[PDB]
Amino acid sequence: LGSELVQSSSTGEICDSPHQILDGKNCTLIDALLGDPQCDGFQNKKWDLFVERSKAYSNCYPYDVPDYASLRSLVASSGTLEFNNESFNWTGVTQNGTSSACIRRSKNSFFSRLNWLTHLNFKYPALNVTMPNNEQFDKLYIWGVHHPGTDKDQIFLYAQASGRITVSTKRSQQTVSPNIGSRPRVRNIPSRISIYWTIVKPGDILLINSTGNLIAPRGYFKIRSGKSSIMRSDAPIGKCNSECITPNGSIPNDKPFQNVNRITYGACPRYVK
């Protein structure tokens, strides 16, 4: 309250020091995480602050994330996309499904970090696969359920009228079933995928049970930090050094308060309206 206690101005530009900034450009953090074909340049990157642009768009299989805001926050705070492949035992199914809705280098493809499993010899066995976490750090697994447009497609892919998936650890259990039906066509696709996530602590075991419709993980992400973050801004990133980042640009950390934006990253004045 009073102009000498409150910072109110900005240059419209975010400084690239002192924090490590990653410009999402045309990719959302979630598309970089799943491995959309336009986002392969983000693999394994780290950040203090991820800057997400309003013109970001998707170019792979159409999907939703029931828990979108939480998964986005978790990965943003973590500050890394470091990914480690694991070899799951997918005996009895066909692996590596691809789609014309997801083109990579001019061929049908799919999210790089997910594995679209389908029937083998007209049988989709009841999969029961495990992956112990014998590491000293937490693992994050991203997986999904495919919702076909029609019963014909469901049968063609899975040789099963309705899949059931349960993914569990000693600490949690999630069970999902496809919702078959035709939705508006995105890149000519009336079907969808819904994305889910599961953390496995050291000493715990990932258990995956599926009878159909599983979009499987190929491995795990690490959880690196709890102090990175994400912000939506269209400000350019320039070569300068400034302590407090806001969507409206970086500002110095000088007065007790600021009314530039309630969203900030770094050592900053407190927001006051």
Ligand SMILES: *[C@@H]1O[C@H](CO)[C@@H](O)[C@H](O)[C@H]1NC(C)=O
């Ligand atoms: C993969 O899983 C099946 C269980 O249905 C088993 O028969 C097979 O031996 C497993 N492979 C390995 C290498 O454990």
Ligand SMILES: *[C@@H]1O[C@H](CO)[C@@H](O)[C@H](O)[C@H]1NC(C)=O
């Ligand atoms: C599936 O793709 C993975 C990685 O792209 C590859 O290593 C593997 O050989 C493929 N498996 C099959 C059964 O096609």
